[model samples]
Target: MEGMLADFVSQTSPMIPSIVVHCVNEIEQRGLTETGLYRISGCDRTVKELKEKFLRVKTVPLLSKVDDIHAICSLLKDFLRNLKEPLLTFRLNRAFMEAAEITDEDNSIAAMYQAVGELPQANRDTLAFLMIHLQRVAQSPHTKMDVANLAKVFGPTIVAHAVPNPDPVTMLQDIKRQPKVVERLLSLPLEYWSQFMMVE
Candidate 1:
């Protein structure tokens, strides 16, 4: 780990199964309809507005293309739209439930709604758009390696899962002392997930 923990308290802790279990319990008891609640909380609006904005802006670029760019852009846009929506929803919802400030009355559901409220519409749209482009690019033979490389570049952030884990105490302390370890681990790639036992 390279980056030093600014302070022990500042570091995000590890995932606590108990907290997640508790949060899950709260979710069930509260009669919170995950999708419906998200809609009520404005996440649905945020997501919808973002998608529209991307399409609006993306159309200009597609229209400007001299070659088969329109067709290509159309394909790209469609691809992005198809792949990103569910992922964005899932990511936002998970972050809300597991990471944000939770309370006794509203619990994780409230926290997630708050999370959606905090994001700028443009950022949300851009993230969704990028996810589409990234997924498409990753699928192309020409860009497959580049995609993996790009993931490597952002490996730390994606693996940032442990930080905002529902139980932050243990998770935080585990990596707090060695901030660089996760980055190092992420560089190893997904293929290694099954090879730990074979490693010398």
Candidate 2:
């Protein structure tokens, strides 16, 4: 009934959602050089329609119809946003965010590693691949979405409160720290990710 990461990953591929894999592969091959690739929002109608086609269990749509590369990019964002829980999972929002807040590099990395170890396998795999893809996109320089920009764009979608509405004060705080968490993940040493993610 909902686009949960675990459910979608199980149905499509053992590691990550098929839509994700498809979008990442296509974007790398075709849209890496496109300015503002992930930062730009595509056609609203195109993204909405693409979301529906991928929502149901079957009827996987082909990418040939998508003239706007941003449409697929938008679709990818929508999938993460629409997830019943954020990609990093709801239970550990504070755990990860607090890890990001650490001032000391060694302590923060250790805390984050602990938090990453606790994520469900599907979430870990998908997040790992996306981080790698974001790094690749940053390398293009043409996209102008450096690690910080990519982290900012993707931060909110990667984590959410367990509830839709929560205390405004804490909610704002949580939302603010989301990007820091992602930035840390993006900038972490490759060796750090090797423990959890199968880097390809």
lDDT to native, each model: 0.32, 0.82
RMSD (Å) of each candidate, 1 decimal: 20.5, 2.4
User: Can you give the lDDT of residue 198 in candidate 2?
Assistant: 49
Off by over 4 Å in 1: 1-118, 146-149, 155-200
Work out the TM-score per prediction: 0.24, 0.91
* Tens digits of lDDT, candidate 2, 44-161: 9988877776676454489867899999899888888778888988899889889999999999988888988899889888887887788889889689889899888888788766
Q: Which candidate has the highest TM-score of all? A: 2
82 in model 1: Cα distance from truth in Å? Answer: 29
